[PDB]
Amino acid sequence: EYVVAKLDDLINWARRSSLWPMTFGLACCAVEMMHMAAPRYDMDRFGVVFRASPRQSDVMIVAGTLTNKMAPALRKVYDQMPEPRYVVSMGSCANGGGYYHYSYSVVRGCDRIVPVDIYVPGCPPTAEALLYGILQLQKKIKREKRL
Amino acid sequence: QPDVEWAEQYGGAVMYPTKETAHWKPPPWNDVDPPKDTLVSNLTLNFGPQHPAA
Numbered sequence: 001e002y003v004v005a006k007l008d009d010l011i012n013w014a015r016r017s018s019l020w021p022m023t024f025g026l027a028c029c030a031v032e033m034m035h036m037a038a039p040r041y042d043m044d045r046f047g048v049v050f051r052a053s054p055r056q057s058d059v060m061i062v063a064g065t066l067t068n069k070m071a072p073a074l075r076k077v078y079d080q081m082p083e084p085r086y087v088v089s090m091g092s093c094a095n096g097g098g099y100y101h102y103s104y105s106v107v108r109g110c111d112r113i114v115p116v117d118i119y120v121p122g123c124p125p126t127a128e129a130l131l132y133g134i135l136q137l138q139k140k141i142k143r144e145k146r147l
Numbered sequence: 148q149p150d151v152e153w154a155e156q157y158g159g160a161v162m163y164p165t166k167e168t169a170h171w172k173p174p175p176w177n178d179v180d181p182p183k184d185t186l187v188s189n190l191t192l193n194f195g196p197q198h199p200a201a
Protein backbone atom coordinates (compact mmCIF):
# COMPACT_ATOMS: atom_id res chain seq x y z
CA GLU A 1 0.00 0.00 0.00
CA TYR A 2 2.64 2.52 1.16
CA VAL A 3 5.70 0.20 1.07
CA VAL A 4 4.77 -0.88 -2.51
CA ALA A 5 4.42 2.76 -3.68
CA LYS A 6 7.79 3.77 -2.15
CA LEU A 7 9.64 0.71 -3.52
CA ASP A 8 8.76 1.75 -7.10
CA ASP A 9 10.28 5.18 -6.39
CA LEU A 10 13.39 3.44 -4.95
CA ILE A 11 13.93 1.59 -8.27
CA ASN A 12 13.35 4.92 -10.06
CA TRP A 13 15.86 6.55 -7.66
CA ALA A 14 18.63 4.42 -9.24
CA ARG A 15 17.93 6.03 -12.64
CA ARG A 16 17.66 9.38 -10.83
CA SER A 17 21.11 8.69 -9.32
CA SER A 18 23.22 7.57 -12.32
CA LEU A 19 22.83 7.06 -16.08
CA TRP A 20 25.63 6.05 -18.46
CA PRO A 21 25.71 7.85 -21.86
CA MET A 22 26.81 6.56 -25.28
CA THR A 23 29.67 8.28 -27.12
CA PHE A 24 27.91 8.85 -30.46
CA GLY A 25 30.64 10.61 -32.46
CA LEU A 26 28.11 11.67 -35.07
CA ALA A 27 28.84 15.40 -35.65
CA CYS A 28 29.79 18.76 -34.00
CA CYS A 29 27.25 18.06 -31.24
CA ALA A 30 29.59 15.23 -30.13
CA VAL A 31 32.30 17.84 -29.38
CA GLU A 32 29.96 19.62 -26.91
CA MET A 33 28.99 16.13 -25.67
CA MET A 34 32.70 15.82 -24.78
CA HIS A 35 32.29 19.12 -22.88
CA MET A 36 30.01 17.24 -20.46
CA ALA A 37 33.18 15.39 -19.45
CA ALA A 38 35.05 18.74 -19.35
CA PRO A 39 35.43 19.97 -15.70
CA ARG A 40 33.85 23.47 -16.03
CA TYR A 41 30.41 22.00 -16.82
CA ASP A 42 30.48 18.49 -15.36
CA MET A 43 28.13 15.56 -14.94
CA ASP A 44 31.10 13.26 -14.22
CA ARG A 45 29.83 11.15 -11.29
CA PHE A 46 27.14 13.80 -10.72
CA GLY A 47 24.95 11.33 -12.66
CA VAL A 48 26.93 10.52 -15.83
CA VAL A 49 29.84 8.10 -16.39
CA PHE A 50 31.30 7.63 -19.89
CA ARG A 51 32.11 3.99 -20.74
CA ALA A 52 30.54 3.31 -24.20
CA SER A 53 29.31 -0.18 -25.33
CA PRO A 54 25.51 -0.19 -26.08
CA ARG A 55 24.97 -3.32 -23.97
CA GLN A 56 26.03 -1.74 -20.64
CA SER A 57 24.60 1.79 -20.94
CA ASP A 58 21.15 3.08 -19.91
CA VAL A 59 20.86 6.31 -21.95
CA MET A 60 21.94 6.92 -25.56
CA ILE A 61 22.52 10.50 -26.73
CA VAL A 62 22.17 10.96 -30.50
CA ALA A 63 24.78 13.67 -31.04
CA GLY A 64 24.24 15.15 -34.51
CA THR A 65 23.31 14.44 -38.12
CA LEU A 66 21.88 11.08 -39.19
CA THR A 67 21.85 9.89 -42.81
CA ASN A 68 20.35 6.97 -44.79
CA LYS A 69 23.76 5.26 -44.44
CA MET A 70 23.39 5.59 -40.64
CA ALA A 71 19.67 4.74 -40.23
CA PRO A 72 20.23 0.94 -40.13
CA ALA A 73 23.30 1.41 -37.88
CA LEU A 74 21.72 3.46 -35.05
CA ARG A 75 18.45 1.44 -35.03
CA LYS A 76 19.97 -1.87 -33.83
CA VAL A 77 22.20 -0.03 -31.29
CA TYR A 78 18.94 1.15 -29.65
CA ASP A 79 17.84 -2.50 -29.86
CA GLN A 80 21.17 -3.53 -28.23
CA MET A 81 20.25 -1.31 -25.25
CA PRO A 82 18.62 -2.83 -22.10
CA GLU A 83 14.81 -2.36 -22.06
CA PRO A 84 14.72 0.56 -19.59
CA ARG A 85 16.25 2.94 -22.16
CA TYR A 86 16.08 6.70 -22.80
CA VAL A 87 17.01 8.60 -25.97
CA VAL A 88 18.10 12.25 -25.84
CA SER A 89 18.26 13.83 -29.30
CA MET A 90 20.57 16.81 -28.82
CA GLY A 91 20.89 19.51 -31.48
CA SER A 92 18.93 20.82 -34.47
CA CYS A 93 20.30 17.96 -36.61
CA ALA A 94 18.88 15.52 -34.06
CA ASN A 95 15.56 17.42 -34.13
CA GLY A 96 15.21 17.59 -37.94
CA GLY A 97 18.42 18.71 -39.63
CA GLY A 98 20.37 21.86 -38.71
CA TYR A 99 20.00 23.15 -42.23
CA TYR A 100 19.48 20.05 -44.41
CA HIS A 101 15.88 18.79 -43.79
CA TYR A 102 15.10 19.34 -47.50
CA SER A 103 18.31 17.43 -48.37
CA TYR A 104 18.56 13.98 -50.00
CA SER A 105 20.63 12.00 -47.47
CA VAL A 106 19.63 13.34 -44.02
CA VAL A 107 16.85 11.53 -42.12
CA ARG A 108 14.53 14.07 -40.47
CA GLY A 109 14.40 14.27 -36.67
CA CYS A 110 15.63 10.83 -35.48
CA ASP A 111 11.99 9.99 -34.55
CA ARG A 112 11.63 8.37 -38.00
CA ILE A 113 14.26 5.79 -36.91
CA VAL A 114 14.27 5.74 -33.07
CA PRO A 115 11.75 7.32 -30.58
CA VAL A 116 12.99 10.24 -28.44
CA ASP A 117 11.96 11.21 -24.88
CA ILE A 118 13.95 14.43 -24.23
CA TYR A 119 14.74 17.06 -26.90
CA VAL A 120 17.62 19.57 -26.78
CA PRO A 121 17.18 22.34 -29.41
CA GLY A 122 20.68 23.89 -29.27
CA CYS A 123 22.98 24.07 -32.27
CA PRO A 124 26.27 24.53 -30.63
CA PRO A 125 24.47 22.87 -27.67
CA THR A 126 25.81 25.04 -24.83
CA ALA A 127 26.92 22.91 -21.88
CA GLU A 128 24.66 25.03 -19.62
CA ALA A 129 21.65 23.99 -21.76
CA LEU A 130 22.99 20.42 -22.13
CA LEU A 131 22.80 19.90 -18.34
CA TYR A 132 18.97 19.93 -18.60
CA GLY A 133 19.22 16.93 -20.97
CA ILE A 134 20.22 14.78 -17.98
CA LEU A 135 18.53 16.71 -15.12
CA GLN A 136 15.10 16.82 -16.82
CA LEU A 137 15.57 13.13 -17.72
CA GLN A 138 15.79 12.29 -13.99
CA LYS A 139 12.80 14.56 -13.28
CA LYS A 140 10.68 12.86 -16.00
CA ILE A 141 11.16 9.45 -14.33
CA LYS A 142 8.28 9.69 -11.84
CA ARG A 143 6.22 6.47 -11.69
CA GLU A 144 6.69 2.90 -12.94
CA LYS A 145 4.51 -0.18 -12.19
CA ARG A 146 1.15 0.39 -10.46
CA LEU A 147 -0.12 -3.22 -10.43
CA GLN B 148 67.16 -57.68 -73.61
CA PRO B 149 64.67 -55.48 -71.76
CA ASP B 150 62.94 -52.46 -73.29
CA VAL B 151 60.88 -49.44 -72.18
CA GLU B 152 57.63 -51.43 -72.45
CA TRP B 153 58.81 -53.78 -69.69
CA ALA B 154 60.17 -50.82 -67.70
CA GLU B 155 56.74 -49.14 -67.55
CA GLN B 156 55.42 -52.06 -65.48
CA TYR B 157 58.08 -51.36 -62.84
CA GLY B 158 57.22 -47.64 -62.79
CA GLY B 159 56.04 -45.85 -59.64
CA ALA B 160 52.43 -46.89 -59.06
CA VAL B 161 51.58 -50.09 -57.15
CA MET B 162 54.14 -52.65 -58.17
CA TYR B 163 51.42 -55.26 -58.66
CA PRO B 164 48.61 -53.07 -59.93
CA THR B 165 44.88 -53.44 -59.73
CA LYS B 166 43.14 -53.69 -56.37
CA GLU B 167 39.95 -52.03 -55.25
CA THR B 168 41.70 -48.72 -55.04
CA ALA B 169 43.84 -46.95 -57.61
CA HIS B 170 43.45 -43.33 -56.51
CA TRP B 171 47.08 -42.97 -55.42
CA LYS B 172 49.40 -40.99 -57.67
CA PRO B 173 53.13 -41.55 -58.12
CA PRO B 174 55.03 -39.40 -55.65
CA PRO B 175 56.48 -36.16 -56.93
CA TRP B 176 60.25 -36.33 -57.33
CA ASN B 177 61.09 -33.60 -54.79
CA ASP B 178 58.15 -33.50 -52.40
CA VAL B 179 54.68 -32.12 -53.13
CA ASP B 180 53.40 -29.09 -54.98
CA PRO B 181 52.54 -26.30 -52.60
CA PRO B 182 49.00 -26.61 -51.36
CA LYS B 183 49.03 -22.88 -51.47
CA ASP B 184 45.34 -23.04 -52.38
CA THR B 185 42.30 -23.04 -50.04
CA LEU B 186 41.53 -20.86 -46.99
CA VAL B 187 42.16 -17.12 -47.28
CA SER B 188 41.88 -16.64 -43.49
CA ASN B 189 40.86 -12.99 -43.89
CA LEU B 190 38.92 -11.67 -40.91
CA THR B 191 36.43 -8.87 -41.65
CA LEU B 192 35.64 -6.13 -39.12
CA ASN B 193 32.88 -3.56 -38.66
CA PHE B 194 35.02 -1.36 -36.40
CA GLY B 195 33.60 2.06 -37.33
CA PRO B 196 29.89 2.96 -37.80
CA GLN B 197 29.23 4.36 -34.29
CA HIS B 198 31.10 4.59 -30.95
CA PRO B 199 34.44 2.74 -31.24
CA ALA B 200 35.93 5.26 -28.73
CA ALA B 201 38.47 5.89 -31.53
Ligand SMILES: NC(=O)c1ccc[n+]([C@@H]2O[C@H](COP(=O)([O-])OP(=O)(O)OC[C@H]3O[C@@H](n4cnc5c(N)ncnc54)[C@H](OP(=O)(O)O)[C@@H]3O)[C@@H](O)[C@H]2O)c1
Nearest residue numbers: 004005008009011012083084085141142143144145146147
Ligand atom coordinates in the same frame (compact mmCIF):
# COMPACT_ATOMS: atom_id res chain seq x y z
N1 LIG C 1 -4.13 -14.67 -28.37
C1 LIG C 1 -4.32 -13.85 -29.41
O1 LIG C 1 -3.39 -13.36 -30.03
C2 LIG C 1 -5.73 -13.52 -29.82
C3 LIG C 1 -6.53 -14.49 -30.42
C4 LIG C 1 -7.84 -14.15 -30.78
C5 LIG C 1 -8.30 -12.84 -30.54
N2 LIG C 1 -7.50 -11.92 -29.96
C6 LIG C 1 -8.05 -10.57 -29.73
O2 LIG C 1 -7.11 -9.55 -30.10
C7 LIG C 1 -6.78 -8.70 -28.99
C8 LIG C 1 -5.27 -8.79 -28.74
O3 LIG C 1 -4.85 -7.82 -27.79
P1 LIG C 1 -3.62 -8.14 -26.80
O4 LIG C 1 -4.00 -9.31 -25.92
O5 LIG C 1 -2.36 -8.20 -27.62
O6 LIG C 1 -3.56 -6.82 -25.88
P2 LIG C 1 -2.63 -6.77 -24.57
O7 LIG C 1 -1.26 -7.29 -24.94
O8 LIG C 1 -3.37 -7.39 -23.42
O9 LIG C 1 -2.50 -5.18 -24.33
C9 LIG C 1 -3.60 -4.41 -23.85
C10 LIG C 1 -3.12 -3.14 -23.15
O10 LIG C 1 -4.24 -2.41 -22.64
C11 LIG C 1 -4.12 -2.18 -21.23
N3 LIG C 1 -5.34 -2.66 -20.51
C12 LIG C 1 -6.21 -3.58 -20.95
N4 LIG C 1 -7.21 -3.80 -20.05
C13 LIG C 1 -6.98 -2.99 -19.00
C14 LIG C 1 -7.64 -2.71 -17.69
N5 LIG C 1 -8.77 -3.35 -17.33
N6 LIG C 1 -7.06 -1.79 -16.87
C15 LIG C 1 -5.93 -1.14 -17.21
N7 LIG C 1 -5.28 -1.35 -18.38
C16 LIG C 1 -5.74 -2.25 -19.30
C17 LIG C 1 -2.90 -2.94 -20.74
O11 LIG C 1 -2.07 -2.07 -19.95
P3 LIG C 1 -1.33 -2.57 -18.61
O12 LIG C 1 -0.41 -3.69 -19.05
O13 LIG C 1 -0.60 -1.34 -18.13
O14 LIG C 1 -2.45 -3.01 -17.69
C18 LIG C 1 -2.19 -3.44 -21.98
O15 LIG C 1 -0.93 -2.79 -22.19
C19 LIG C 1 -7.60 -9.17 -27.79
O16 LIG C 1 -8.40 -8.09 -27.31
C20 LIG C 1 -8.44 -10.34 -28.27
O17 LIG C 1 -9.84 -10.07 -28.18
C21 LIG C 1 -6.24 -12.24 -29.60
Ligand code: SF4
Nearest residue numbers: 027028091092093123
Ligand atom coordinates in the same frame (compact mmCIF):
# COMPACT_ATOMS: atom_id res chain seq x y z
S1 SF4 D 1 22.86 20.72 -34.50
FE1 SF4 D 1 24.52 22.20 -35.02
S2 SF4 D 1 26.26 21.62 -33.63
FE2 SF4 D 1 24.81 19.85 -33.64
S3 SF4 D 1 25.59 18.47 -35.28
FE3 SF4 D 1 24.03 19.82 -36.26
S4 SF4 D 1 25.23 21.57 -37.11
FE4 SF4 D 1 26.59 20.50 -35.60
